[PDB]
């Protein structure tokens, strides 16, 4: 019976809430009350990557911590040499509406996607010398929000069809689809051990998925609006989410509940991009107020501000070695902070 | 110097890429980007066919002007997450069907299709991303509007309306309603045209409207607005 199904669902939700409350003894704030404050973090624009002529929507660092791919609505993917400003490649996209870009860990592939609902894998290490489309993954019925490379052959893609998918690059077929979100999934972040990944959607919920199994292991509901950015803690046992409710939250996997929210009264604009630091102490979030705020992870204190963008900060990435922070925005500029 | 031969050649390659990007941006800035919108059965397909997946990009050239029409009707997702991608288009081509005044949607039969079109027009005309993006409003299916207003009255859609059941009065009333749905009439303009299948002047109307939007954008850039 539908009524009895709904009653059982409500009872199970109550049981989950009771378990979460029982597991909650002391919040993260009390435990990290005595730790020394991070201090006023002051970063400066060490590099400005010019050349984009439209709003930059995505940016992914390479594993070498030097190469950087940026996506903008001008229809171009530019691979930047961050150390010395140098456009290594300028890939002309078939569809100029790109809201995500990815860099393979090997560096041989770069993937972009967007309103065309197709994740285009581009090959960089080719004999002809020009970047070419290795594979065009199709099957998503909504706009592509975030794609991340498992390896050279597997990619996990989140779309606005309320589903995430895992693709085989060689076969171009969806190995596994991930369903359960009610709203449009807007971001994903692979775990450091690449076993799991978390996806945040417009349903104000974050879900942790098992890549090999293909079903959701955990759900997290703490936000009051659509989650736009999700990032995984370097430890691999926690993650952070940013939403339009102007608050960032940290979710633990073991405790299955939010640990601490990052909210300020003056912050009214939402969060577009979130990326943790190498040590996990610093949470860098990109807001629509044309600013990036550096947040202490263990303390709900604003460590600093990365102002300098004339429009909304849309993407934010931290290098693997943690020596740079890129915060490309809608003003068609990328800035490498340090 | 302090740059090796390979570093110097890399700088040369970067400069070549910069030149290509500047050329492409100059080419794009001369192109007209039009966002096409509609509510289901509205003649968006007819308009696309007359003026020759998630997004359908139709490019056409008319009077030495390169156009770029983007159709987002097949997205089927939250419009508020990707509608800011189109902030900056020259104009929005909004198509409503005058034959939907008598017809209701498959679901929620209490609500009328023309009222859904009005709701979408209100949502996108008054959206924060489109405050100066002029709307080229199109009222297609005017032949079926003739046939239907001959028999059925407009009271079903708008009960307040009280006028002659001829074409002119009802069409003017619908156009007036859609125009008064525009809250910000000081920074944006609504261009309205009556079309159907057997029309060849639609492309010319869009060209004239875009010419006006370009002139106004130039006036704004020069600061005279």
């Amino acid at each position: 019976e539908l009524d009895q199904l709904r009653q059982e669902a409500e009872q199970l939700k109550n049981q989950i809430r009771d378990a979460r409350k029982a597991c909650a003894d002391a919040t993260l704030s009390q435990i990290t009350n005595n730790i020394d404050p991070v201090g006023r973090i002051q970063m400066r624009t060490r590099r400005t990557l010019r050349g984009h002529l439209a709003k930059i929507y995505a940016m992914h660092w390479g594993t070498d911590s030097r190469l950087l791919v940026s996506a903008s609505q001008d229809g171009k993917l530019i691979i930047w040499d961050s150390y010395t400003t140098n456009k290594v490649h300028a890939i002309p996209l078939r569809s100029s509406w790109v809201m995500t870009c990815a860099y393979a860990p090997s560096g041989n592939y770069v993937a972009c996607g967007g309103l065309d609902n197709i994740c285009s894998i581009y090959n960089l290490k080719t004999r002809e010398g020009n970047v070419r489309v290795s594979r065009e993954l199709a099957g998503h019925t909504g706009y592509l929000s975030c794609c991340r490379f498992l390896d050279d052959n597997q990619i996990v893609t989140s779309s606005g069809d309320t589903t995430c998918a895992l693709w085989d690059i060689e076969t171009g077929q969806q190995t596994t689809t991930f369903t359960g979100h009610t709203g449009d999934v807007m971001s994903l972040s692979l775990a450091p051990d690449t076993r799991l990944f978390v996806s945040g959607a417009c349903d104000a919920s974050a879900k942790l998925w098992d890549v090999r199994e293909g079903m959701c292991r955990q759900t997290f509901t703490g936000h009051e609006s659509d989650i736009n950015a999700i990032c995984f803690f370097p430890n691999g046992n926690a993650f952070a989410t940013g939403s339009d409710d102007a608050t960032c939250r940290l979710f633990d996997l073991r405790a299955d509940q939010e640990l601490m929210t990052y909210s300020h009264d003056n912050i009214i604009c939402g969060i577009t991009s979130v990326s943790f630091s190498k040590s996990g102490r610093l949470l860098l979030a990109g807001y629509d107020d044309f600013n990036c705020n550096v947040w202490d992870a263990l303390k709900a204190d604003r460590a600093g501000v990365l102002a300098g963008h004339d429009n909304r900060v849309s993407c934010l990435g931290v290098t693997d070695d943690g020596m740079a922070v890129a915060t490309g925005s809608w003003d068609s500029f990328l800035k490498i902070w340090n | 110097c302090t740059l090796s031969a390979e570093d110097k050649a890399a700088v040369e390659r970067s400069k070549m890429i910069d030149r290509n990007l500047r050329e492409d941006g100059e080419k794009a800035a001369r192109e007209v980007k039009l966002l096409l919108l509609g509510a289901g059965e509205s003649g968006k397909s007819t308009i696309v066919k007359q003026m020759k997946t998630g997004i359908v990009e139709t490019h056409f050239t008319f009077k030495d002007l390169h156009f770029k029409m983007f159709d987002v009707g097949g997205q089927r997702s939250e419009r508020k997450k990707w509608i800011h991608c189109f902030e900056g288009v020259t104009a929005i081509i909004f198509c409503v069907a005058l034959s939907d005044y008598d017809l209701v949607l498959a679901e929620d039969e209490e609500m009328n299709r023309m009222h859904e079109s009005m709701k979408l027009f209100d949502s996108i005309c008054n959206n924060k991303w489109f405050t100066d993006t002029s709307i080229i409003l199109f009222l297609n299916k005017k032949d079926l509007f003739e046939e239907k207003i001959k028999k059925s009255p407009l009271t079903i859609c708008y009960p307040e309306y009280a006028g002659s059941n001829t074409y002119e009065e009802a069409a003017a009333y619908i156009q007036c309603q859609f125009e008064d749905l525009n809250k910000r009439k000081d920074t944006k303009e609504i261009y309205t045209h009556f079309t159907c299948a057997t029309d060849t002047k639609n492309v010319q109307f869009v060209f004239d409207a875009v010419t006006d939007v370009i002139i106004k954008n130039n006036l704004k850039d020069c600061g005279l607005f």
Partner: single-chain antibody
Framework: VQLVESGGGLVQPGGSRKLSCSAS????????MHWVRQAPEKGLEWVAY????????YYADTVKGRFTISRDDPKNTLFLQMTSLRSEDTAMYYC??????????????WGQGTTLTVSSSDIVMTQATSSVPVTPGESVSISCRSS???????????LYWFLQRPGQSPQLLIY???NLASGVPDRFSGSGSGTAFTLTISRLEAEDVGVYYC?????????FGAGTKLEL
């Protein structure tokens, strides 16, 4: 990827000739182009280089003024106009492609080459090893040393290793003395400290039989070595 070269043949001394390198199978516009000679019984010698877009044109001292290099990008061909030929120019000319970006591989492909027969303060790299007798399964280490340190302030040392099989164009083995070229077996490895360099073959096969050349890219008057000959 094919780089077929035309021209060549007997040329009277003091005459003129034009060498064409027809490029097919890759983006010719985005690749810088090189010209390398090889005397009938000697090593290689760089001649000319034209960059992508023809912005940068560098010649060798022995050919400065006499020779000019140009490319027809739409036609996918590379030219070498040769004027006032001398007996020192009697060599087999190799047309070389080289792309330059971060992590790029220069000098990947060498053409078959054309033989031109004329009738009757730069870095110096020496390979004193000369002829070496080798056996299959052995591990040889070819050593090449440079006049001045090839390490740069950017951290990228700029030594290149090439392989000339008998009757074949040189094939890139190592670039930046650490990086294996695409399509090169893992048995090859390069090491050095900036002035002295090594090329190690852990396992030796009959394909490795040939002569090896060490090249520098720090200063564009590119200099090869004498060429250590490995024989079975």
């Amino acid at each position: 990827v094919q780089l077929v070269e035309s021209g060549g043949g007997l040329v009277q001394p003091g005459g003129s000739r034009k060498l064409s390198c027809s490029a097919s199978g890759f983006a010719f516009s985005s690749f810088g182009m090189h010209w390398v000679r090889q005397a009938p019984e000697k090593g290689l010698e760089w001649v000319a280089y034209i960059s992508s877009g023809s912005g940068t044109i560098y010649y060798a001292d022995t050919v400065k003024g006499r020779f000019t290099i140009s490319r027809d990008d739409p036609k996918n061909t590379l030219f070498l106009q040769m004027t006032s030929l001398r007996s020192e120019d009697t060599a087999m000319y190799y047309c070389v492609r080289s792309i330059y970006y971060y992590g790029s591989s220069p000098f990947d492909f060498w053409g078959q080459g054309t033989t031109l027969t004329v009738s009757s303060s730069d870095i110096v790299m020496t390979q004193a090893t000369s002829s070496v007798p080798v056996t299959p399964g052995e591990s040889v280490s070819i050593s090449c040393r440079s006049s001045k340190s090839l390490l740069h302030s950017n951290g990228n040392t700029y030594l290149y290793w090439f392989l000339q099989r008998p009757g074949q164009s040189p094939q890139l083995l190592i670039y930046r003395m650490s990086n294996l070229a695409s399509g090169v077996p893992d048995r090859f490895s390069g090491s050095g400290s900036g002035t002295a360099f090594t090329l190690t073959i852990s396992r030796l096969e009959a394909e490795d039989v040939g002569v090896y050349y060490c090249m520098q890219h720090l200063e564009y008057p590119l200099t090869f070595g004498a060429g250590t000959k490995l024989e079975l």
